[PDB]
Amino acid sequence: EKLGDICFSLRYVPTAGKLTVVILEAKNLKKMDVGGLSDPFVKIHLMQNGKRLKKKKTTIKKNTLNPYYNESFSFEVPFEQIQKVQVVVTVLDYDKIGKNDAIGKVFVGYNSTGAELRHWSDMLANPRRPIAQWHTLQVEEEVDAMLA
Ligand SMILES: [Ca+2]
Ligand SMILES: [Ca+2]
Ligand SMILES: [Cl-]
Ligand SMILES: [Cl-]
Ligand SMILES: [Cl-]
Ligand SMILES: [Cl-]
């Protein structure tokens, strides 16, 4: 059972120092509820050098492995700093009681690789243009080890 995939857009406006992330949809999420599906929501963190700088989150979708969000988030990152940050996208299962367990996550930006680096590079190369791309979710343990 794969963890799932997430589709989001990135847009960077260098003059304004405006970094926009639109969480579009996730698919094929791992089932997190016993005898059910999942109740997924998404967190978006701006990081640098192992520090959480800013945190944003989507609404919760109930009883789905294939949630649509279409929710936009913006961060202030000046052009002198944009190459030095990470944007971390985490899908979690909401439970009314207990910690919300991460399904999986990915990050783009400084120290990203593969399709994550490709997405970030495309954003940087195309100022003011939103670029949507799919990403495979990865186990929290591994991504956090990269980010710490
Ligand atoms: Ca659960
Ligand atoms: Ca749940
Ligand atoms: Cl909600
Ligand atoms: Cl708990
Ligand atoms: Cl939480
Ligand atoms: Cl894609």
C-alpha torsion sign, points 61, 116, 118, 2: negative
Number of domains in the chain: 1
Please list, in sequence order, all residues whose beta carbon lies within 8 angstroms of the beta carbon of residue 87, skipping any fewer than 6 positions away.
10, 19, 21, 44, 45, 46, 47, 75, 107, 108, 109
Binding residues, by number, are: 33, 39, 93-95
Please list, in sequence order, all residues whose beta carbon lies within 8 angstroms of the beta carbon of residue 118, skipping any fewer than 6 positions away.
133
Count of Cβ atoms closer than 10 Å to residue 62 Cβ: 12
C-alpha torsion sign, points 127, 130, 133, 139: positive
What technique solved it? X-ray
Q: What range does the domain containing 144 cover?
A: 1-148
Contact between residue 29 and residue 65 where contact means Cβ atoms under 8 Å apart:
yes
C-alpha torsion sign, points 84, 47, 109, 148: positive
d(CA 8, CA 131): 8
- Of the listed ligands, the closest to the CA of 41 is 3
Please list, in sequence order, all residues whose beta carbon lies within 8 angstroms of the beta carbon of residue 55, skipping any fewer than 6 positions away.
43, 44, 45, 46
User: How far apart are the CA of 142 and the centre of ligand 6, in A?
Assistant: 22
User: How far apart are the CA of 110 and the centre of ligand 4, in A?
Assistant: 32
